[PDB]
Design a protein around this ligand. Structure first.
Ligand SMILES: C[S@@+](CC[C@H](N)C(=O)[O-])C[C@H]1O[C@@H](n2cnc3c(N)ncnc32)[C@H](O)[C@@H]1O
Ligand SMILES: C[S@@+](CC[C@H](N)C(=O)[O-])C[C@H]1O[C@@H](n2cnc3c(N)ncnc32)[C@H](O)[C@@H]1O
Lengths: 228, 244
């Protein structure tokens, strides 16, 4: 239990986010691997686009919920979805895919070392010319231009320029009855993940901001990465 | 090779053939006050200083009478320290113990009443290596001994995080930034116009504090201070102890 300065813990439809993934993939022949699929907040929208989806999830309990939802769906929908228990930071399906997909909530679950395991696992499950697509929440600090500081320093005079670039923040939530719950989660800057992707061998061909809920301020980025 | 910053991009473009871009840390043509912050918040006996470098802090510490063990990873840096230590008075020279080691995974046949590390040093370490540091420090602290850290504090790290309510309170807390610098001569001509760039890790002081608590320390004080004695307080002095 985290006792924030404002003192119980604390522990949305995926159609728009899913359509954004579909925009940045285009033709997609063959199956799509979705990492940390949860109970299908994105997977069901993906299936509705006609995609064949291998949905990977770590939790037994979450898998049961997903399986139940799938039993409730029409046969043609359920038939296009393959559920697999695994760890997105270290998995082996002995099988490659034209497209690999991961959501922001998912990637922000992993620390730095685990993200490297993720990147490497993905490399092993991409077919040549395959696409690795990520969505990433973008905070106010992450989208803003960094304030550059300038100082004149001395014999020879130099000008020093200093900027601080966003890398990682904590999203803190205190739930509050109006007349008290708690959560802190990781919030990586899209630019930080892009740096990490390049470092792990990927070329990042595009970063498209979008609105998670499909309207209003653009609060997310869709990153397309490919293997050279 | 070197980091190509937006301001560097435009400089080099508008300078042509005279322009040279290199990282700040290669071909490249403070201390006593940060040292005093440490001295102010501390001795019964020997101090351990981690990642001592060439002794920007260590020599100030030695001038206070301290027995210092200075741990450093780089062999050439240690050689350079040793050279500076050779020109030092015999009494200063005898109170200094130089040791080669990794501050993320080190083991000495000694414990200490005080262990110190500066901002530049802890920011060299990724998250995993920082956990290795905290565990190692705990093992080298005598009962009641203190772990003292100095931590650079950016403007975003210094500000009160912006809230947005709906009631649902949402704050975004700084955890880690990248400090990016660009340095060039104030003129334009010069003969060779060299532009230095560098990118480095810059942890939020509160993030390191969260990590220390998680690691088993009690953080008993955090005092902001100015790295050049005066001006904006751009640094925090953290004191941590083991509970018991
Ligand atoms: C914030 S949710 C995102 C789920 C979904 N893609 C969405 O957009 O709603 C993170 C999910 O990843 C799962 N998860 C956490 N770590 C995992 C791991 N290492 N491998 C696979 N799944 C993981 C959790 O069980 C949880 O269901
Ligand atoms: C920013 S300087 C700090 C030096 C000194 N404490 C000061 O305030 O001037 C970083 C120093 O840490 C050393 N270093 C880097 N990683 C290290 C490690 N894992 N263990 C010990 N020293 C390390 C480098 O060789 C360098 O001397």
């Amino acid at each position: 239990p985290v006792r924030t300065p404002h003192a119980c813990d604390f522990y949305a439809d995926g159609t728009s986010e899913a359509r954004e993934f579909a925009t940045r993939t285009g033709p997609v022949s063959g199956p799509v691997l979705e990492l940390a699929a949860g109970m299908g907040r994105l997977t069901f929208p993906f299936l509705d686009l006609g995609w064949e989806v291998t949905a990977l999830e770590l939790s037994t309990s979450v898998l049961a919920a997903f399986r139940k939802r799938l039993a409730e769906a029409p046969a043609d929908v359920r038939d296009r979805c393959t559920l697999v228990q695994g760890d997105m930071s270290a998995f082996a399906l002995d099988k490659r895919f034209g497209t690999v997909v991961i959501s922001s909530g998912s990637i922000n679950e992993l620390d730095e070392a685990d993200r490297r395991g993720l990147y490497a696992s993905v490399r092993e499950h991409l077919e040549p010319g395959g696409k690795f697509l990520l969505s990433l929440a973008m905070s106010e600090a992450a989208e803003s231009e960094p304030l550059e500081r300038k100082q004149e320093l001395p014999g020879r005079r130099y000008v020093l320029h200093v900027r601080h670039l966003p890398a990682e923040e904590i999203q803190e939530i205190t739930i509050h009855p109006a007349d008290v719950c708690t959560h802190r989660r990781r919030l990586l800057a899209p630019d930080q993940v892009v740096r990490e992707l390049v470092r792990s061998g990927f070329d990042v061909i595009a970063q498209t901001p979008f609105a998670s809920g499909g309207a209003g301020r653009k609060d997310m980025v869709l990153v397309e990465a490919v293997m050279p």
